[PDB]
Amino acid sequence: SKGEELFTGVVPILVELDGDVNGHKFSVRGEGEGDATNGKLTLKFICTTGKLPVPWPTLVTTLVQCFSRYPDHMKRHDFFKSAMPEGYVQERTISFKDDGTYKTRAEVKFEGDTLVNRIELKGIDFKEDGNILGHKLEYNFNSFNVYITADKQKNGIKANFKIRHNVEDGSVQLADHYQQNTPIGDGPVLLPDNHYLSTQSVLSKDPNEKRDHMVLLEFVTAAGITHGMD
């Protein structure tokens, strides 16, 4: 790509999310930076409307897979960077087992030198005293493999995967993710062979921050392609 060239160094990131879950309206803003060469990013998120009405871990996947490290032998399979700078639309349905559903639409693109993720999230049918609206989820995350496939009649990619959030009573809350990404612009993109993204996330708190917030460190490497060396 020349989309690839845009990620050779450290890139500033801005994330803005506008949310509505059972009529609770909220906003989140995140800032930090990404380094695709090492598949690493660092971000701090603030709930700008006050107290966040859902648990922070439930928003992680919604809150820039263009910062994945693709190994050399797999560069031909990186849709996310090939869509830059014009970007891509990322849509999900996140279905919480025995509870509500989030639907998300985001545009991920450059605005000047900053990579921007701008999201709208709508959440419906949540149980007012279930694990989500009742804040019964632990503050932690885990590592996941996200399987990527080429959209079979169209010009983007797809992914489905399960996130498992720990609940405070020792159980797990499932969040089944269905994802589609499609380019904003018109010019050629890379359509990948089947592979996956090996993802790891660590959450923390800033001892000096008294707003409702999440600090996040993430490492993401692509894997699972046998051919393309030398």
Numbering used by the authors: 2 to 64, 68 to 234
What did the original publication write about this model?
Replacement of H148 with azF results in a ∼90 nm blue shift in the major absorbance peak to the less favourable 400 nm, indicative of the chromophore (Cro) ground state equilibrium being dominated by protonated (neutral) form. The likely explanation for the absence of N2 is that the azide moiety accesses multiple conformations through rotation but we cannot rule out loss of N2 during X-ray bombardment during data collection. The H148azF mutation removes two H-bonds from the Cro hydroxyl group to: (1) the original 148 imidazole and; (2) the OH side chain of T203. Both these H-bonds are key to Cro deprotonation in the ground state, so their removal promotes the neutral phenol form. The structure suggests T203 side chain rotates so that the hydroxyl group is further from Cro (4.8 Å versus 2.7 Å in sfGFP) and poorly orientated to H-bond to Cro. There is also a shift in the position of the loop housing residue 148, bringing it closer to the adjacent β-strand 6 resulting in the expulsion of a water molecule. WB is observed at a similar position in other GFP variants (e.g. EGFP,43,46 the S65T GFP variant and YFP41) but absent in sfGFP148azF, with the nearest water molecule ∼7.5 Å away. The loop housing residue 148 shifts on substitution of His for azF, with one of the main consequences being closure of solvent channel and breaking the water interactions network through to the chromophore; it is narrower in sfGFP148azF with only a single water observed in the channel. Visual inspection and analysis using CAVER52 shows that the channel and water interaction network is similar in terms of pathway, width and residue positioning in original sfGFP, sfGFP148azF+1 and irradiated sfGFP148azF (c and S11†). The equivalent features are absent in dark state sfGFP148azF.
